[PDB]
Amino acid sequence: AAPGKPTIAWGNTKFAIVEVDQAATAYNNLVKVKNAADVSVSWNLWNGDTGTTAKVLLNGKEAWSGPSTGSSGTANFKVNKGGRYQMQVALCNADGCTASDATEIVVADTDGSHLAPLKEPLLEKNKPYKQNSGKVVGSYFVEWGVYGRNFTVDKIPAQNLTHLLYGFIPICGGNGINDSLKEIEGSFQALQRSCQGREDFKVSIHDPFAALQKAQKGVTAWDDPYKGNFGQLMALKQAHPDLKILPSIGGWTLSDPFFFMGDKVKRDRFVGSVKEFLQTWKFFDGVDIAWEFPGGKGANPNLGSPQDGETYVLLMKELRAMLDQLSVETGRKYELTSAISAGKDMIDKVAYNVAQNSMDHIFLMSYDFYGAADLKNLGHQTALNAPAWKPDTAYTTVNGVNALLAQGVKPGKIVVGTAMYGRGWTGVNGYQNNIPFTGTATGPVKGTWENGIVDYRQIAGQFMSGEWQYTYDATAEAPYVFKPSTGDLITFDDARSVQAKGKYVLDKQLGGLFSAMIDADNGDILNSMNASLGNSAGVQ
Numbered sequence: 001a002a003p004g005k006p007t008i009a010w011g012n013t014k015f016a017i018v019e020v021d022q023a024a025t026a027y028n029n030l031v032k033v034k035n036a037a038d039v040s041v042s043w044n045l046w047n048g049d050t051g052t053t054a055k056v057l058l059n060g061k062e063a064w065s066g067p068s069t070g071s072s073g074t075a076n077f078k079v080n081k082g083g084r085y086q087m088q089v090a091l092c093n094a095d096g097c098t099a100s101d102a103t104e105i106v107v108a109d110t111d112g113s114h115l116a117p118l119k120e121p122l123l124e125k126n127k128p129y130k131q132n133s134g135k136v137v138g139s140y141f142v143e144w145g146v147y148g149r150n151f152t153v154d155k156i157p158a159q160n161l162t163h164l165l166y167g168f169i170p171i172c173g174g175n176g177i178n179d180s181l182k183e184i185e186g187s188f189q190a191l192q193r194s195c196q197g198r199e200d201f202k203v204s205i206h207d208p209f210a211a212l213q214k215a216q217k218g219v220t221a222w223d224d225p226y227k228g229n230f231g232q233l234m235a236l237k238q239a240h241p242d243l244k245i246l247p248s249i250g251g252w253t254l255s256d257p258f259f260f261m262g263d264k265v266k267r268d269r270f271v272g273s274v275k276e277f278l279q280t281w282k283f284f285d286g287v288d289i290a291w292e293f294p295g296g297k298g299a300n301p302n303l304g305s306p307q308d309g310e311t312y313v314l315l316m317k318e319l320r321a322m323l324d325q326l327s328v329e330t331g332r333k334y335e336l337t338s339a340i341s342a343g344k345d346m347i348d349k350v351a352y353n354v355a356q357n358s359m360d361h362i363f364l365m366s367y368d369f370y371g372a373a374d375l376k377n378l379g380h381q382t383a384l385n386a387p388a389w390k391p392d393t394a395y396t397t398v399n400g401v402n403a404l405l406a407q408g409v410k411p412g413k414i415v416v417g418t419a420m421y422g423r424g425w426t427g428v429n430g431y432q433n434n435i436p437f438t439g440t441a442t443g444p445v446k447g448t449w450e451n452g453i454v455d456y457r458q459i460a461g462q463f464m465s466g467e468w469q470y471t472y473d474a475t476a477e478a479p480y481v482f483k484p485s486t487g488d489l490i491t492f493d494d495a496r497s498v499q500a501k502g503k504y505v506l507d508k509q510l511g512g513l514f515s516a517m518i519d520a521d522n523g524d525i526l527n528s529m530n531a532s533l534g535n536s537a538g539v540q
């Protein structure tokens with residue numbers, strides 16, 4: 001007679017191809033990429049002949065086979081593809097094979113193939129749009145937004161984006177290499193801990209707790225191997241396989257290492273670590289370079305060199321070559337993007353007409369034109385055009401676009417920036433003709449999270465009532481709110497100025513719109529980004 005029917009033993013059924021060490025703070029120890037997950041199954045036979053061969057089947061296909069030598073057995077084997085499998089144990093002899101009932105096993109991998117799709121309802125004022133304009137609709141999500149801002153990946157209105165950028169991936173380095181982090185309490189030390197044992201100029205993760213270990217919706221079980229932002233982003237990719245999720249390297253406080261990459265030894269090590277990062281974290285679709293900025297005038301006053309423009313072009317070429325090789329190794333398309341200053345003086349430090357041939361998209365940072373760092377020269381921080389009271393205003397969106405076009409950049413490369421926050425001042429005074437921007441300020445506006453910066457959600461929720469004046473400047477295409485009794489002035493984007501930017505993108509055949517940062521919108525800004533670029537209402 002055929003063997004008795006085996007009973008699969010109770011035991012762990014959750015396995016991982018990329019293993020995460022739960023007691024490690026150094027990135028080198030935190031993550032271990034294997035070629036395959038080590039899987040184990042045991043069984044007991046309570047009634048019958050134990051057969052002469054035991055097999056472990058996954059979806060009917062043998063993963064392991066060995067002699068059946070007693071009433072219990074154990075099998076250890078490797079599984080090299082992520083997903084969920086119906087596992088069975090079969091006992092066979094010359095008279096037949098008898099298979100157990102199936103037990104699901106989970107083999108995790110960083111494409112999220114083990115995860116249920118993270119398909120969450122739109123929140124706040126977000127309305128559904130189909131991505132059918134063919135234009136970029138991008139936004140940055142900040143790793144630290146999960147703390148005080150409580151804005152997690154399940155709150156992203158992901159169906160309303162083509163590109164979701166994750167800010168920010170650091171580059172390892174201590175004194176002289178990441179000194180801009182010392183301005184933020186604990187932040188330099190946190191990077192040194194993550195990079196312990198790791199060579200300078202390789203990428204790492206700044207906050208591994210937020211990125212990988214914090215419990216979040218859909219990844220709360222203790223043995224879910226990928227939690228935090230990365231676990232949710234993997235599940236988001238399962239829900240939106242056409243969403244491009246790009247890691248953004250740099251930003252305001254993690255850009256200092258780029259200034260050393262004139263040394264090709266360091267630049268090669270960096271590019272190689274990006275390749276390894278993309279091989280490790282398979283849900284990411286490329287890389288965004290947010291080097292702020294070639295030539296300096298970023299956070300660090302002691303960095304910046306006339307060599308930087310040449311370094312940037314080389315870096316983009318070499319990243320592109322690395323990504324092209326990864327693309328053909330994988331069959332995937334990978335994107336290379338960069339967030340860049342929108343000031344003409346900054347733009348002309350770089351030959352974007354050459355670099356563009358390596359780049360899928362240029363994220364023109366047409367915001368932060370004005371702010372509380374300068375209390376004397378006030379103006380619209382993200383306007384399309386100059387205002388009527390100062391038509392020679394240098395820092396406008398159109399002036400940045402025109403600087404790129406004048407170099408020879410193809411318009412389709414250029415993605416125009418919108419701000420989901422205001423900047424502003426307090427004590428504005430001494431202004432003419434009811435235009436507060438012609439005065440001067442005594443200090444920054446009180447901010448939502450830090451001085452001088454206000455979430456758009458808070459502008460809309462608190463500063464469009466009471467004593468606050470509201471004005472839309474139709475020459476600049478720029479709203480502002482002003483409280484006369486305290487001299488608080490806030491400059492920001494709203495649905496109408498975003499609509500002007502979208503129409504401008506379509507009229508000039510630019511590439512689309514992007515925003516910073518997604519946590520600060522109540523939905524009005526991203527709704528207008530989508531509507532103004534011609535995306536249809538509804539779901540696809």
Ligand SMILES: CC(=O)N[C@@H]1[C@@H](O)[C@H](O[C@@H]2O[C@H](CO)[C@@H](O[C@@H]3O[C@H](CO)[C@@H](O)[C@H](O)[C@H]3NC(C)=O)[C@H](O)[C@H]2NC(C)=O)[C@@H](CO)O[C@H]1O
Pocket residue numbers: 144147148149184186187190206207209253254449450
């Ligand atoms: C540019 C950049 O590198 N990031 C800055 C942020 O780091 C900073 O936000 C704060 O981030 C730290 C972690 O990096 C948060 O600390 C966490 O705090 C919680 C309790 O609040 C604690 O349980 C976490 O374990 C702890 N992690 C670490 C490593 O400290 C801190 O709470 C964040 N604060 C906020 C925003 O809520 C922001 C400040 O806005 O500035 C960035 O530039």
